[PDB]
């Protein structure tokens, strides 16, 4: 066939042309770190957390946006790859606020877990952090944008999945802020999903605010009945009480999204 | 402060009070219901709003390592005060 | 620590040996004096349990 | 420590040792209950440079067991050299 | 090897134990199924359960083994396997100042040969395995429950046994006796999901699917 | 010892009582003073040392008759050897930190957890999820005050 | 290195044999034991006059729990639930919601003082020093229900023992 | 041989008055049992190797104290006791025949960890 | 070969009578064999690699004293991990439980091109970056 | 696939010999159990309880499962004979302090959600 051969840490794998370095590592069970890449949105390549060394190449490549060339040996655990993940994680946490105890994302946060799996264990940052002013985008999504890492997943989702071009980046540089610029409400039938695709606690559920923590919930896999689509959901419960509703991936029904009524 | 429902049972700071028909009130017969009278919501509101001449101010809660993690608060918004998410202290920008 | 593949720092190792041997005196005082108490001798229990 | 010299002699004589030198009751020789604040040192990883975690990561240097034999001329060997014989204490060989 | 926070690696012992592992396998090919040495220099001999007595007797009596002390005997319950149980022997050699692990397996219904003839220490350890796991040991002097209550039903250390059991005790005044009734908890044990969804150790990754 | 060691009443209750032979002690899984009371020269603090026990000097008491009396002498003598070790620990105590300088295993100082983003993440995760231990099984044993105390951790 | 504890041979010279004969007949070594206990009779007893004299403790003592406040009077707890997650005995139960002013605060904070093992992990895990184990060790009760503390009991403990808790922390926070 | 030790130091282990004679008997007896083991069995080759090495030292060290150091097996009575344990094992190894191929391979994932 | 003098037993493995479990918890239960779904709040996929066996949820009520969540179900916290679906089904049938099996859901491979973000004549051109 | 090591019995005929032997041992021991433990039940009640316990496991057809039941049952008899059990343990077979749970659908429907 047209399949080309690439190596992931020396293991051969046959991938279709156009496949990305990140997708080639999935074929062998390896998951590359990521904050901006989502398998159902456009490729951004702006978090630089997926940098992976390619053998016999002096430069690291964005694994989420780099197509695989034939005969490449992707080194997912070399010193260069691991030193690229520590630097990027160090830059993500430089201005991030010490909000973990009061942040609803604590315990199920990709920034926490990838900081403890791919980053360093301390900080050499001896300055003052940045502070951003919060924004109101409706009664459903609570915004604390000091925690935003400018991953643009909410921008791509709102424009592509929801077909609403209301979110964007204003300013430039370290002062780049995600928002609607003007006082506007991102009220859409798929508006609640920006909570999930936000890796940090910048976007969180307002009804669910402060009620529970991820580890103490019990997950019941059920079906949504608010409409005839039959969206698959997870009913999170704690001590005999329903706490929140979450999407459950089903490729042929609802992807990994659910409408606001369901959520 | 501490309120009292019509039955005379003191309402806690969490809004808890047994209804008239609730049998669980019997546990207080011959004893007392322990209610803390120093409502935090009331006390924190008594603190004055501090004026600071900068866009961004930081709060560690007072005492350094005896306080809370140091967070940074934005004061650009002129229609409200900036509030610390740990201790509740409020800050404002000097004449903007 | 063997499974983690880490090593405790030298000062911690000495404290653990220090209190490991203070803990040995706690055990042997209990063992010897309660052994004597069962056999009948009762006063050594009181002298060494103040230590 | 308040015992009279007569009783001190009597208790010393009966036990056969100078008890007053090693009293089992503590007096002002103990440390003060209030002590000055400490300033604890930092570990060897409290550096600002040449301190990447991939160079000091113990957990990531653990490997799965090395399989010697699997079912999927030579000299006899013991698990280790025979244990060396112990030597009698030079401090107090016989109690 | 100068790194303060990383455990030093002893490669001399790793070599010696690997050589003795082959030594055992060459002498007992009839039972030895697998041999391995961990990164912390511990040797494991995996055997067919029919070789419990031959393998242990060799290690106890052989001149170059002299494993004359049974440090411990225990079982591990892994429900995913056909032989869910895994009988583990830890032996200590005072002559050669070394330790070895012998591992076998059995299911709920297959007996395992008793080790009492080799090690008298195994008398009480095998009662514990039967008591807490339900593994029967053949030719045991007196096989009984050793840790659970009299008339206790079930083997607690099985993974499918609930943490709080099925019965609880209280004193009933009507019958002037201590009675057993189905378990009810004023506060249920809260189950936490703590596993991170991000792989921690690439070196131990399994082949896909 | 003035009350027990040379007391004839005490010696009657202990001498030639509970004799265990050296070969039976090993085959029954005995350890510690039970082995040493029968003359077996074995102490894990000297043969398989851990921590810093190879940097301290002490003697291992050894019995000769394997009876309750000899094992009593070993315990009284070990208490003297523990004072010997403590004297060396009090003098050779070094400076430095007291937990491994690896915040992915041991929590950071509270002053660091309230100042550094990385430390707060690690304090949060260590006290909620804990640190992951790589797969494997180990049998670790020490010379506990009353024998070989071991853990088979999987 | 090792040493024999009971490997000795008694000298068989006539004087030594007679010395042992006197010991056997005249009970010499049994009178040393009498002398040893006689000396203790004249030593000052080590007994303290409780409850008027209390055994010494240290600032690190782990006693009765208390929920602390800031100098402003605001509660320190922000319902992070780290103490609930690390509690070895699962003795802590927490529920929280947005307060009327928007703050993150608990509507429930229960410690079952009969499940608690008084280990101090909860105060090691708290990021804001909200939950502490105080120096009180005299709180025995006449009923099992009085040891099931709720947020109201724990706040009163904080308002009760703050003058002492704050001083003990001051004397120990540089070791934490 | 020199002076005869008064005690072995191990409870229940009597002092042997003819150690060199007793060790020749046992080591020789071991080599006789190993003959009935198949010539290519690893137990026969290894046990014969070590047994001859021990037997060689016994026949070249008339002094007991010096012989203990060369054998490195503790007191001479411990070495005699271990020669008797090697003889019982050799007799039992004949009835077990562990040199035969593996009785049965385990299920495919019987020794996989983690589950 | 073996010399243990084996015997032939031809019948489905069943240990319900020797496990010690009460009758009411072998016949009225329903064990759900499934691969846990990804926690949508994260991107990691390491929790969706092993099969699990959880039982049906029973009643939880409110403790009249402290309001805690009380239960009378001994198997409310019982989760078993299996390497394969057939391993899970074998364990369920061995212990007599009734089981429902949910087939694994794997994300489908997707064609991701960064060059499609800037397309000459397609709707995949992005208005923002 | 079907070859397995037996515990004691090679077939059901051999396993049922042990079951009947165990029933005799229990049948003869009830009169003493009601006597030594001073149970307030009669021999008829106790011997009917033994019969009930045996009948619960009458549908078994696996000789290995039957052997475990006899082995477990023999251990129960040993504790009763030697008075390792107390009056509480013997009387735990009768559930005297448990209110009889409903069996029909309507009764279970009213009182709760369990099947
Ligand atoms: C038989 C011998 C009886 C002698 C009388 C006891 C005596 O006076 O001892 C003093 C004195 C105290 O000895 P100590 O143990 O060193 O005193 C400890 C502190 O110094 C003691 O210092 P302190 O400051 O603690 O003293 C305080 C103490 C005052 O201490 C004393 O006064 C000693 C007790 C006498 C009163 O106050 C009291 O408690 C007085 C009440 C004592 C209890 C009542 C007993 C009275 C005698 C029997 C009453 C029944 C009839 O004993 C001696 O020095 C030698 C006594 C033998 C002399 C030969 C007699 C023939
Ligand atoms: C309170 C007021 C005072 C009470 C009376 C004084 C206390 C008297 C008893 C304690 C004596 C102190 C201990 C002591 O010195 O003994 C050590 C000494 C030392 O004992 P030894 O065991 O070390 O050896 C001494 C003898 N050689 C060396 C030969 C083995 O013990 C004696 O000498 C006691 C001898 C007295 C023998 C009397 C027995 C017959 C009694 C007849 C009835 C009258
Ligand atoms: C007894 C009188 C004292 C005799 C004495 O001590 O003289 C020394 C003499 C040699 O002593 P020695 O070489 O050490 O060994 C004994 C060898 N027969 O010792 C001897 O040879 C004496 C040999 C033993 C004969 C006496 C044995 C019977 C017990 C006698 C009791 C002596 C104590 C009685 C109290 C005397 C004081 C009043
Ligand atoms: S987004 Fe994650 S790292 Fe940032 S404060 Fe929230 S939980 Fe902590
Ligand atoms: S708000 Fe969340 S999803 Fe949007 S850019 Fe920031 S981190 Fe990404
Ligand atoms: S001291 Fe320990 S057991 Fe007690 S509440 Fe705190 S963490 Fe839980
Ligand atoms: S750890 Fe402290 S802040 Fe967090 S819930 Fe417990 S008491 Fe509150
Ligand atoms: S995941 Fe590739 S740069 Fe963000
Ligand atoms: K989010
Ligand atoms: Zn603050």
Chain-centre distance of CA J2, in angstroms? 29
Give me the count of residues in chain I.
129
State the helix-helix crossing angle for F68-92 and C10-39, rounded to 10 degrees.
150
Query: Nearest 5 degrees, angle CA A52-CA A53-CA A59?
Result: 110
Residue owning tokens 């000299």? D75
Residue of F118, F121, F126, F128 to test ligand 4 pocket, by largest number of atoms within 8 Å of CB: F121
Pick from E73, E136, E147, E132: which is nearest to E108 by CA?
Answer: E136
What one-character-per-residue DSSP string does B30-68 give? TS--------HHHHHHHSPPEEESSSEEEE--SSGGGS-
Q: Among A100, A113, A120, select the one facing F120 at the smallest CB separation.
A: A100
What one-character-per-residue DSSP string does H39-87 give? TT-HHHHHHHHHHHHHHHHHTT---HHHHHHHHTSSSHHHHHHHHHHHH
CA-CA-CA-CA torsion for I86, I90, I96, I102, nearest 10 degrees?
-10
Distances (CA, A) of F118 to A100, A109, F103, F133: 11, 14, 9, 20
Instruction: Please state, as a whole number, how many other Cβ atoms lie within 10 Å of the Cβ of residue D91.
Output: 12
| Largest CA-CA distance found in chain E, in angstroms, rounded | 71
Binding site listing of G for [4Fe-4S] cluster: 77, 80, 83, 87, 116, 119, 122, 126
The minimum-distance atom of ligand 1 relative to the CA of D4 is 16
Burial state string for F14-42 with b = 16 or more CB within 10 A and e = fewer than 16 = bbeeebbbbbebbbbbbbbbbbbbbbbbb
Q: How far apart are CA G106 and CA G126, in angstroms?
A: 14
- Output the residue whose Cα is nearest ligand 1's atom 22: D2
Q: How far apart are CA E103 and CA E74, in angstroms?
A: 10
Strands E137-138 and E112-113 turn out to be parallel
Q: How far apart are CA A198 and CA A153, in angstroms?
A: 7
Answer whether G46 touches C (CB < 8 Å).
yes
Pick from I22, I67, I77, G86: which is nearest to E186 by CA?
Answer: I67
Q: How far apart are CA G166 and CA E179, in angstroms?
A: 49
Element (H, E) at I82: strand I79-82
Cβ A108 vs Cβ A102: under 8 Å: no
- Which residues, other chains included, contact H64 with Cβ-Cβ below 8 Å and sequence gap of 6+? H1, H2, H19, H20, H76
- Show contacts of G163-169: CB within 8 Å, 24+ apart: G164/G134, G164/G135, G165/G66, G165/G68, G165/G132, G165/G134, G165/G135, G167/G59, G168/G59, G168/G60, G168/G61, G168/G135, G169/B66, G169/G59, G169/G129, G169/G132
A-chain residues near E189 (CB < 8 A): none
Cβ E33 vs Cβ H106: under 8 Å: yes
Residue I112, helix vs strand vs coil: coil
- Show contacts of A133-137: CB within 8 Å, 24+ apart: A133/B74, A133/B76, A133/B77, A134/B74, A135/A179, A135/A180, A136/A183, A136/A185, A137/A179, A137/A180, A137/A184, A137/A185, A137/A186
Q: Among I2, I81, I83, select the one facing H104 at the smallest CB separation.
A: I2
Strand partners, A62: A51
Question: Would you state the structure tokens that stand for residue D5, as one six-digit string?
Answer: 């010299």
Residue owning tokens 């040379």? F6
Interface contact flag, E54 H100, Cβ < 8 Å: no
Interface contact flag, E188 I70, Cβ < 8 Å: yes
Strand partners, F140: F151
Give me the count of residues in chain H.
115
The helix, strand and coil proportions of chain G, stated in percent and rounded to the nearest 5, come to: 35, 15, 50
CA–CA min distance E50, chain D (Å): 16
- Which residues, other chains included, contact H53 with Cβ-Cβ below 8 Å and sequence gap of 6+? none
Residues 32-91 of D with CB under 8 A from H: 71-73, 75-76, 82, 85
Pick from F36, F53, E68: which is nearest to D79 by CA?
Answer: E68
Strands (DSSP E) along A4-63, which ranges?
Answer: 4-8, 11-15, 51-54, 61-62
Q: For A233, list phi and psi in degrees, rounded to 5.
A: -135, 165
For residue A64 and ligand 8, the question of a CB distance below 6 A is answered with yes
Pick from B22, A210, F84, H79: which is nearest to I64 by CA?
Answer: B22
Cβ E57 vs Cβ H93: under 8 Å: no
Residues 73-92 of B with CB under 8 A from A: 73-74, 76-77, 85-86
Expt. technique = cryo-EM
Q: How far apart are CA D90 and CA A222, in angstroms?
A: 77
Computed over its alpha carbons, how large is the radius of gyration of chain F? 22
E-chain residues near D79 (CB < 8 A): 16-17, 20, 43, 65, 93, 96, 98, 100
Rounded to the nearest angstrom, the distance between the alpha carbon of G61 and the centre of ligand 7 is: 20
Q: For I68, list phi and psi in degrees, rounded to 5.
A: -65, 175
Q: For F139, list phi and psi in degrees, rounded to 5.
A: -110, 110
Question: Would you state the structure tokens that stand for residue A239, as one six-digit string?
Answer: 């001590």
Interface contact flag, H103 I83, Cβ < 8 Å: no
Q: How far apart are CA E59 and CA A215, in angstroms?
A: 47
Q: How far apart are CA A235 and CA A263, in angstroms?
A: 10
Give the ligand with the smallest distance to the CA of B83: 10
Interface contact flag, B60 F114, Cβ < 8 Å: yes
Question: Would you state the structure tokens that stand for residue H80, as one six-digit string?
Answer: 């005699």
Question: Would you state the structure tokens that stand for residue D52, as one six-digit string?
Answer: 């990447």
The minimum-distance atom of ligand 8 relative to the CA of A62 is 2
CA-CA-CA-CA torsion for A145, A148, A154, A156, nearest 10 degrees?
130
Q: How far apart are CA H73 and CA H61, in angstroms?
A: 15
CA–CA min distance I19, chain E (Å): 5
Pick from G108, G114, G109: which is nearest to G145 by CA?
Answer: G114
CA–CA min distance F136, chain A (Å): 19
Order of all β-strands in the sheet with E43-47? D66-70, E32-37, E43-47, E98-103, E85-93, E69-77
Q: How far apart are CA I79 and CA E163, in angstroms?
A: 11
B77 phi-psi bin (left φ>0, alpha ψ -120 to 50, beta other) = beta
Interface contact flag, A131 B70, Cβ < 8 Å: no
- Output the residue whose Cα is nearest ligand 6's atom 2: G119
Chain-centre distance of CA A70, in angstroms? 29
Q: How far apart are CA I26 and CA B9, in angstroms?
A: 48
Question: Would you state the structure tokens that stand for residue F90, as one six-digit string?
Answer: 């009090």
Residue D19, helix vs strand vs coil: helix
Cβ A94 vs Cβ A174: under 8 Å: no
Instruction: Please state, as a whole number, how many other Cβ atoms lie within 10 Å of the Cβ of residue B56.
Output: 18
Distances (CA, A) of B57 to B75, B92, F8, F62, I50: 8, 9, 81, 70, 48
Q: For D93, list phi and psi in degrees, rounded to 5.
A: -60, -35
Q: How far apart are CA G35 and CA G44, in angstroms?
A: 16
Question: Would you state the structure tokens that stand for residue J54, as one six-digit string?
Answer: 């045996």
Interface contact flag, F96 D58, Cβ < 8 Å: no
Chain A CA closest to residue I116: A42
CA–CA min distance D10, chain E (Å): 52
Within 6 Å (CB) of ligand 6, which residues are found?
G 86-89, 91-92, 111, 116-122, 133
CA–CA min distance E150, chain G (Å): 27
Pairs of residues, one from chain C and one from chain E, whose beta carbons lie less than 8 Å apart: 19
Declared resolution, Å: 2.7
Q: For H12, list phi and psi in degrees, rounded to 5.
A: 85, 5
Answer whether E41 touches D (CB < 8 Å).
no
- Which residues, other chains included, contact J55 with Cβ-Cβ below 8 Å and sequence gap of 6+? none
Q: How far apart are CA A20 and CA A63, in angstroms?
A: 7
Chains that touch I (3 or more CB pairs under 8 A): A, E, G, H, J
3-state SS record for A161-227: CCCCCCCEEECCHHHCEEECCCCCCCCCCCCCHHHHCCCCCCEEECCCCCCCCHHHCEEEEEECCCC
Q: Among I2, I50, I83, select the one facing H103 at the smallest CB separation.
A: I2
3-state SS record for chain F: CCCCCCCHHHHHHHCCCCCCCHHHHHHCCCCCHHHHCCCCCCCHHHHCCCCCHHHCCCCEEECCCCCHHHHHHHHHHHHHHHHHHHHHHHHHCCCCCCCCCCCCCCCCCHHHHCCCHHHHHHHHHHCCCCCCCCCCCEEEEEEECCEEEEEEEC
Cβ F64 vs Cβ G6: under 8 Å: yes
Interface contact flag, F136 E39, Cβ < 8 Å: yes
I5 phi-psi bin (left φ>0, alpha ψ -120 to 50, beta other) = left
Q: How far apart are CA F1 and CA B44, in angstroms?
A: 66
Question: Would you state the structure tokens that stand for residue A190, as one six-digit string?
Answer: 């798929």
Strands B82-83 and G92-98 turn out to be unpaired
Residue of A90, A98, A117, A200 to test ligand 4 pocket, by largest number of atoms within 8 Å of CB: A200
Question: Would you state the structure tokens that stand for residue J1, as one six-digit string?
Answer: 């696939």
Chain I CA closest to residue H95: I3
CA-CA-CA-CA torsion for C38, C39, C41, C47, nearest 10 degrees?
-50
For residue A93 and ligand 4, the question of a CB distance below 6 A is answered with no
Mutate to test the interface with B, among F114, F122, F124 (most CBs of B within 10 A): F114
Q: For G160, list phi and psi in degrees, rounded to 5.
A: -90, -45
What one-character-per-residue DSSP string does A224-243 give? --SSTT--EEEEEESSS-EE
Pick from G175, F10, F91: which is nearest to C42 by CA?
Answer: F10
Instruction: Please state, as a whole number, how many other Cβ atoms lie within 10 Å of the Cβ of residue I9.
Output: 19
Pick from E118, I12, F79: which is nearest to J62 by CA?
Answer: I12
Chain-centre distance of CA D22, in angstroms? 25
Chain E CA closest to residue G110: E187
Chain A CA closest to residue E187: A239
Q: How far apart are CA E23 and CA D74, in angstroms?
A: 10
Element (H, E) at C43: helix C43-50
């Amino acid at each position: 066939s047209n399949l080309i051969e690439v190596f992931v840490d020396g293991q051969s794998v046959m991938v279709e042309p156009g496949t990305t370095v990140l997708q080639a590592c999935e074929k062998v069970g390896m998951q590359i770190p990521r904050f901006c890449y989502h398998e159902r949105l456009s490729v951004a390549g702006n978090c630089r957390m997926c940098l992976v060394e390619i053998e016999k190449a002096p430069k690291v490549v964005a694994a989420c946006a780099m197509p695989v060339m034939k005969g490449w040996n992707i080194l997912t655990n070399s010193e260069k790859t691991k030193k690229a993940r520590e630097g990027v994680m160090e830059f993500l946490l430089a201005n991030h606020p010490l909000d973990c105890p009061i942040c609803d994302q604590g315990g199920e946060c990709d920034l926490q877990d990838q900081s403890m799996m791919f980053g360093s264990d301390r900080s050499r940052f001896l300055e003052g952090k940045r502070a951003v002013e919060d924004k109101n985008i409706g009664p459903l999504v609570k915004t604390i944008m000091t925690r935003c890492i400018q991953c643009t997943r909410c921008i791509r989702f709102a424009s592509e999945i929801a077909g609403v071009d209301d979110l964007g980046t204003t300013g430039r540089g370290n002062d780049m802020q995600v928002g609607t610029y003007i006082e506007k409400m991102f009220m859409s039938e798929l508006s609640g999903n920006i909570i999930d695709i936000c890796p940090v606690g910048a976007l969180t559920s307002k009804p669910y605010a402060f009620t529970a923590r991820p580890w103490e919930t019990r997950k019941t896999e059920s079906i949504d009945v608010m409409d005839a689509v039959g969206s698959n959901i997870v009913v999170s419960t704690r001590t005999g009480e329903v706490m929140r509703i979450l999407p459950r991936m089903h490729e042929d029904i609802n992807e990994e999204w659910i409408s606001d009524k369901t959520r | 402060g501490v309120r009292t429902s019509p039955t005379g049972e003191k309402v806690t700071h969490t809004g808890q009070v047994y209804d008239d028909g609730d049998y669980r009130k019997v546990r207080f017969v011959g004893r007392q219901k322990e209610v803390n009278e120093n409502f935090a919501i009331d006390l924190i509101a008594e603190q004055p709003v501090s004026q600071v001449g900068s866009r961004v101010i930081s709060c560690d809660g007072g005492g350094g390592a005896l306080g809370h993690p140091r967070v940074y608060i934005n004061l650009d918004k002129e229609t409200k005060t900036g509030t610390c998410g740990y201790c509740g202290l409020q800050f404002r920008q000097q004449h903007h | 620590e063997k499974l983690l593949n880490i090593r405790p720092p030298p000062r911690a190792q000495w404290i653990r040996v220090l209190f490991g041997e203070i803990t040995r005196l706690l055990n042997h005082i209990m063992a010897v004096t309660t052994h004597a108490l069962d056999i009948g001798a009762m006063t050594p229990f009181f002298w060494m349990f103040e230590e | 420590a308040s015992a009279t010299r007569f009783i001190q002699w009597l208790r010393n004589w009966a036990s056969g040792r100078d008890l007053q030198a090693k009293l089992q009751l503590r007096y002002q020789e103990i440390s003060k209950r209030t002590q000055p604040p400490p300033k604890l040192p930092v570990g060897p990883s409290h550096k600002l440079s040449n301190n990447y975690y991939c160079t000091r990561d113990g957990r990531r240097e653990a490997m799965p067991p090395s399989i010697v034999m699997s079912s999927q001329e030579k000299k006899a060997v013991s698990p280790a050299p025979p244990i060396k014989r112990w030597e009698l204490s030079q401090d107090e060989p016989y109690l | 090897d100068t790194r303060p926070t990383v455990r030093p690696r002893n490669d001399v012992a790793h070599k010696q134990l690997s050589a003795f592992g082959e030594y055992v396998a060459e002498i007992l090919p009839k039972y030895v199924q697998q041999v391995q040495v961990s990164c912390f220099n511990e040797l494991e001999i995996c055997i067919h359960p029919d070789g419990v007595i031959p393998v242990l007797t060799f290690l106890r009596d052989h001149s170059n083994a002299q494993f004359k002390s049974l440090a411990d005997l225990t079982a591990v319950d892994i429900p995913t396997r056909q032989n869910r149980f895994e009988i583990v022997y830890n032996l200590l050699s005072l002559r050669f100042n070394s330790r070895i692990r012998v591992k076998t397996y059995t299911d709920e219904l297959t007996p395992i040969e008793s080790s009492v003839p080799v090690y008298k220490a195994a008398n009480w350890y095998e009662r514990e395995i039967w008591d807490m796991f339900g593994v029967f040991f053949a030719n045991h002097p007196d096989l009984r429950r050793i840790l659970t209550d009299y008339g206790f039903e079930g083997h607690p250390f099985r993974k499918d046994f609930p943490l709080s059991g099925y019965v609880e005790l209280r004193y009933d005044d009507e019958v002037k006796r201590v009675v057993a009734e189905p378990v009810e908890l004023a506060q249920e044990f809260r189950k936490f999901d703590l596993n991170s969804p991000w792989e921690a150790f690439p070196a131990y990754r399994q082949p896909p699917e | 010892e003035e009350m027990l060691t040379n007391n004839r009443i005490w010696r009657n209750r202990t001498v030639d009582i509970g004799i265990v032979t050296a070969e039976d002690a090993l085959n029954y899984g005995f350890s510690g003073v039970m082995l040493r009371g029968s003359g077996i020269q074995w102490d894990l603090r000297k043969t398989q040392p851990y921590d810093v026990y190879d940097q301290v000097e002490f003697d291992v008491p050894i019995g000769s008759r394997g009876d309750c009396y000899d094992r009593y002498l070993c315990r009284v003598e070990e208490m003297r050897q523990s004072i010997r070790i403590i004297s060396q620990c009090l003098n050779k105590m070094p400076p430095g930190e007291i937990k491994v300088d690896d915040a992915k295993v041991s929590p950071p100082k509270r002053a660091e957890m309230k100042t550094s983003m990385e430390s707060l993440i690690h304090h949060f995760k260590l006290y909620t999820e804990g640190y992951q231990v790589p797969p494997g099984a180990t049998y670790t044993a020490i010379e506990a005050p009353k024998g070989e105390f071991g853990v088979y951790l999987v | 290195t090792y040493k024999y504890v009971n490997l000795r041979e008694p000298s068989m010279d006539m004087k030594s044999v007679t010395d042992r004969a006197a010991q056997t007949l005249l009970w010499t070594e049994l009178i040393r034991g009498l002398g040893m206990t006689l000396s203790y009779l004249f030593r000052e007893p080590a007994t303290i006059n409780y409850p008027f004299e209390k055994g010494p403790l240290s600032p690190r003592f782990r006693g009765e729990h208390a929920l602390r406040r800031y100098p402003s009077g605001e509660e320190r707890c922000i319902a992070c639930k780290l103490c609930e997650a690390v509690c070895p005995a699962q003795a802590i139960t927490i529920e929280a919601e947005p307060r009327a002013d928007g703050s993150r605060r608990t509507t429930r904070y229960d410690i079952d003082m009969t499940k608690c093992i008084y280990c101090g992990f909860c105060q090691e895990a708290c990021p804001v020093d909200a939950i502490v184990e105080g120096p009180n060790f005299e709180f025995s009760t006449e009923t099992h229900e009085e040891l099931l503390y709720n947020k109201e009991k724990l706040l009163n403990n904080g308002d009760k023992w703050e003058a002492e808790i704050a001083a003990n922390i001051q004397a120990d926070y540089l070791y934490r | 041989a020199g002076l005869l030790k008064k005690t072995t130091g191990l409870v229940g282990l009597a002092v042997c008055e003819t150690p060199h004679e007793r060790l020749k008997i046992l080591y020789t007896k071991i080599l006789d049992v190993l003959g009935h083991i198949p010539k290519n069995a690893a137990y026969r080759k290894y046990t014969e190797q070590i047994t001859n090495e021990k037997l060689s030292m016994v026949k070249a060290e008339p002094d007991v104290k010096k012989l203990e150091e060369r054998l490195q097996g503790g007191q001479i009575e411990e070495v005699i006791l271990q020669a008797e344990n090697e003889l019982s094992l050799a007799r039992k190894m004949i009835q077990w025949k562990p040199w035969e191929p593996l009785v049965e391979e385990p299920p495919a994932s019987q020794w996989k960890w983690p589950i | 070969t073996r010399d243990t003098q084996l015997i032939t037993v031809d019948e489905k493995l069943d240990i319900t009578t020797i496990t010690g479990v009460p009758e009411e918890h072998i016949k009225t239960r329903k064990a759900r064999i499934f691969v846990p779904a990804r926690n949508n709040m994260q991107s990691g996929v390491n929790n969706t690699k092993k099969w699990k066996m959880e039982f049906d949820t029973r009643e939880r009520w409110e403790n009249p004293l402290m309001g805690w969540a009380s239960t009378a179900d001994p198997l409310s916290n019982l989760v078993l991990t299996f390497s394969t679906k057939e391993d899970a089904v074998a364990f369920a049938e061995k212990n007599g439980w009734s089981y429902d099996v949910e087939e694994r859901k794997v994300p489908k491979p997707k064609s991701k091109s960064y060059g499609a973000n800037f397309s000459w004549n397609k709707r995949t051109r992005v208005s923002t970056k | 696939s079907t070859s397995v090591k037996p515990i004691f019995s090679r077939d059901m005929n051999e396993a049922k010999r042990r079951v009947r032997e165990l029933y005799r041992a229990w049948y003869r021991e009830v009169p003493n159990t009601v006597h030594l433990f001073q149970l307030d039940i009669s021999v008829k009640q106790g011997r009917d309880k033994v019969r009930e316990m045996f009948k619960k496991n009458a549908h078994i057809t696996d000789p290995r499962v039957v052997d475990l039941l006899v082995i477990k049952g023999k251990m129960e008899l040993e504790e009763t004979i030697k008075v390792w059990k107390q009056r509480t343990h013997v009387m735990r077979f009768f559930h005297e302090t448990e209110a009889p749970r409903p069996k029909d659908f309507l009764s279970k429907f009213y009182v709760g959600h369990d099947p």
